[PDB]
Amino acid sequence: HAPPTLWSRVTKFGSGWGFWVSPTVFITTTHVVPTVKEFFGEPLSIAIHQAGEFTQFRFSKKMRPDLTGMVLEEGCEGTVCSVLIKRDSGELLPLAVRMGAIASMRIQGRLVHGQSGMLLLGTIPGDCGAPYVHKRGWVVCGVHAAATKSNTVVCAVQ
Residue 70, CA atoms < 13 Å, CB-side half-sphere: 25
Domain that holds residue 91: 70-158
Query: Are residue 47 and residue 63 in the same domain, yes or no?
Result: yes
Q: Are 122 and 1 in contact (CB under 8 A)?
A: no
Question: Quick one: which of 102, 77, 82, 86 has its CA closest to 156?
Answer: 102
Q: After what residues is the chain interrupted, C–N > 2.5 A?
A: 35, 45, 76, 120, 137, 150
Residues 6+ apart with CB under 8 A from 108: none
Catalytic residue among 53, 81, 113, 144: 53
- Among 69, 84, 118, the domain-final residue is 69
Give the separation between CA 99 and CA 96, rounded to whole angstroms. Answer: 10
Are residues 75 and 94 both part of a single domain?
yes
Resolution (Å) of this entry:
2.0
Strands in 2-137 per DSSP E = 10-13, 16-20, 25-29, 38-39, 42-43, 47-51, 54-58, 71-72, 80-86, 92-106, 111-119, 131-134
Q: 88 with 48, same domain?
A: no
Question: What is the DSSP code (8-state) at residue 27?
Answer: E
CB count in 10 Å sphere of residue 138: 17
* Residue of 82, 52, 63 whose CA lies nearest to 25: 63
Could you give the maximum distance between any two Cα atoms of the chain, in Å? 42
- What SS3 state is found at 83? strand
Of the residues 76, 81, 113, 128, which is catalytic? 128
Spatial neighbors of 3 by CB under 8 A, at least 6 apart, are none
Is 53 one of the catalytic residues?
yes
Q: Establish whether 76 is a catalytic residue.
A: no
Last residue of a domain, one of 38, 69, 100: 69
> Is 31 noted as a catalytic residue in this protein?
yes
Of 31, 81, 141, 155, which residue is the catalytic one?
31
Looking at the fold, whether 55 and 84 belong to one and the same domain comes out as: no
